[PDB]
Amino acid sequence: MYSDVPKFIRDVSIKQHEWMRESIKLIASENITSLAVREACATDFMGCKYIDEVETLCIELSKELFKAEHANVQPTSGVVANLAVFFAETMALSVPDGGHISHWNHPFDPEEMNIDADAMVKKILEEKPKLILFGGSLFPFPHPVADAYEAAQEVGAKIAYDGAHVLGLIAGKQFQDPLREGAEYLMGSTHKTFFGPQGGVILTTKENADKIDSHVFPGVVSNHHLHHKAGLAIALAEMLEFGEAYAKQVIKNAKALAQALYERGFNVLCEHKDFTESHQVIIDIESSPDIEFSASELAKMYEEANIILNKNLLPWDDVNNSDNPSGIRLGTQECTRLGMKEKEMEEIAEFMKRIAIDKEKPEKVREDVKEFAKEYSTIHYSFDEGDGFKYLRFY
Amino acid sequence: YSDVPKFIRDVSIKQHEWMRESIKLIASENITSLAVREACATDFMHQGCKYIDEVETLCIELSKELFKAEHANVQPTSGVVANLAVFFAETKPGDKLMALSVPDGGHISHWKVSAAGIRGLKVINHPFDPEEMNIDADAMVKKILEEKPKLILFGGSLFPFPHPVADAYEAAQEVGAKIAYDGAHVLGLIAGKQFQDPLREGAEYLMGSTHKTFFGPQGGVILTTKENADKIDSHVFPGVVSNHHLHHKAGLAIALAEMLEFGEAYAKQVIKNAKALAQALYERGFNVLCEHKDFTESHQVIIDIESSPDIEFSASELAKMYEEANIILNKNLLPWDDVNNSDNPSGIRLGTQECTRLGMKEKEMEEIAEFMKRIAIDKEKPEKVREDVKEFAKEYSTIHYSFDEGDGFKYLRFY
């Protein structure tokens, strides 16, 4: 009994490794991590001098990359990284407007995928908030951060930035620089556009210094990652050396992919505003007359063709219980890491056209997709250009 | 930054080798088998994947068998978050929670400074019997009736004897209270059927951490009844929809298998070692708590340093001294410690779970006590004993109670 369980999960995970290798991965929420960072996460770090040094190095590297007077690296995810700053001084996008569920909104025009640059300013004064948050799951264009800190401080309101999806772009100096554009707080997840391990990070100034470190639930003996800290250290160093060139290609690949889709007859949002400035490509399947498939149908069809993406709630949808949403969300951050360029995005968009418009069997397109994906199983923008999806046996 | 990857590579290899040559007695930590560590090492960055649901449903099913529970939830990223979910599910803001107090050995989570400070503000303490190391069961029943809490919580950070779960039941059922058991520290022994059986003693919920006595990866598990299944699933936040975290779930499933096959044997030895180590320390001049009750019924050994006449060192000093001697343990506040706000606690807490995983038996416990006595009572220099200590630890580096007779502290290079 129970002898075959280790073997069963060893075999399944290998199959998972192989499947992901021969797939185009386009989930905006998922990146790929280098063998060096992955090596540090296998050292579970379970009387602790060597943990004190990695702690300080993470803080030392976080201050240099994001340019902050203070940096905390102790939260286990972007969610609690928010909660820690939420507990400090005790609103952002509606879920539908910008995702990101918390319950323990900004003036937004659906046509222009951004917070209203004029209507928000008049909203700051005549609503009297204490915490202004710029952050969302559906984040195509940079938020008016500098158009907010001329009204916040006069009414006595502080400014935070949940760039969980965008953290990696800010590090490579590409999307925006909120911390010098007004934002006093910068939260974020370390595993999305930032190609690090699962973990949360907080960045702030000591201008008043609310000292979050006291109330993030600090356990140095009770319940924390530690093995993810060693990977965080390496990830930072990678983003410090390669982040510039990485975030440049990410934002370009997104654009290239977005236009490639549009030209093939995908109603991807804001063609006049050039689709996005971030890693995301947001497409309206509902108002795509040529398609004829549901966004739910499409995501399930693409998965059969080895194209992984997720259906999304576009602001204009049904009452927030949606088995059948209107949108499909794409992210170029992982594909950029495997070494796909602007010309490679066109090939991807063609695979997507064949399924959605040409109505070609997804099992047939699968063959071309896995042949294309195999050719990009090497981790770029790192010190160790090795085999990603490599399976390392321990016994 | 180019030599940062090489830097932490050395720091982590040194960490491994230092840990190999140390006696690890921190009750909050344990050692993982190579299989479990391999499964985590897959480190997959996670709606697309099908193999993810397969290992997670197997976790749920394995947990149900191991703990004999009608429903299981393996989404929690820690025991603390597991408690949060139950608090969320069973308490509206500003409700009475009955828990074992922090000074009396409860967990930070349970109180106004932590998880309970986020949802259900009003926390009342279990009556505690400091001469024993347990809840005053007789007074407890009375308090249930008088104060009328909605959630009664058993379990603690300082947990040497099983809690009176069954004594609470009838009083709780009258008051309209539910009863939960934070198995964080003791989950492994419960899975090995050794400490107590809360689910068959009146607990509707059994929360836990999967890394403590339970030699799985980091994360938390909630075990409950079919009644509460829908209620619980809804309230645990970091699961299927956001932050998958399905790499430690792969390793959980293996740990579940290991606990099913070796759990009984393992847990039996843990208590036996804890008892032997306590007895070996007592005979040697260490005032280890509750000699009349045979010291422990769990993995822990609590020793009162301040009221150890022979020692002469501070509880705080000894912790730092043992660190220089490669004996890693933690100093702890005792129920009679003047203020909770004390940098200088009176006691030292020990756990035998990892030493048991590494293949140590009662004989080895006596040797560990002998090393400890040399520092504490003989006043032998930490560096002198350290060398004899690191020779003793070197031969206990193989992982027992697994399917792989492999070497823990083994370092795998990925590139």
PDB file of C-alpha atoms in Angstrom, chain A residues 19 23 298-309 366, chain B residues 47-50:
ATOM      1  CA  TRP A  19       3.655  19.221 -21.514  1.00  0.00           C
ATOM      2  CA  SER A  23       3.149  24.556 -25.016  1.00  0.00           C
ATOM      3  CA  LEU A 298     -11.911  29.352 -26.893  1.00  0.00           C
ATOM      4  CA  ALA A 299      -9.796  29.016 -23.728  1.00  0.00           C
ATOM      5  CA  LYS A 300     -10.779  25.351 -23.503  1.00  0.00           C
ATOM      6  CA  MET A 301     -10.035  24.877 -27.218  1.00  0.00           C
ATOM      7  CA  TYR A 302      -6.639  26.580 -27.015  1.00  0.00           C
ATOM      8  CA  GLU A 303      -5.658  24.319 -24.100  1.00  0.00           C
ATOM      9  CA  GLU A 304      -6.277  21.305 -26.374  1.00  0.00           C
ATOM     10  CA  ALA A 305      -3.938  22.947 -28.897  1.00  0.00           C
ATOM     11  CA  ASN A 306      -1.292  23.498 -26.169  1.00  0.00           C
ATOM     12  CA  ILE A 307      -1.952  27.236 -25.913  1.00  0.00           C
ATOM     13  CA  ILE A 308      -2.595  28.194 -22.299  1.00  0.00           C
ATOM     14  CA  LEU A 309      -4.429  31.431 -21.551  1.00  0.00           C
ATOM     15  CA  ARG A 366      -1.460  21.055 -31.600  1.00  0.00           C
TER      16      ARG A 366
ATOM     17  CA  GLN B  47      -6.509  28.265 -15.660  1.00  0.00           C
ATOM     18  CA  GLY B  48      -4.657  25.802 -17.841  1.00  0.00           C
ATOM     19  CA  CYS B  49      -3.192  22.725 -16.216  1.00  0.00           C
ATOM     20  CA  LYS B  50      -4.677  19.266 -15.741  1.00  0.00           C
TER      21      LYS B  50
END
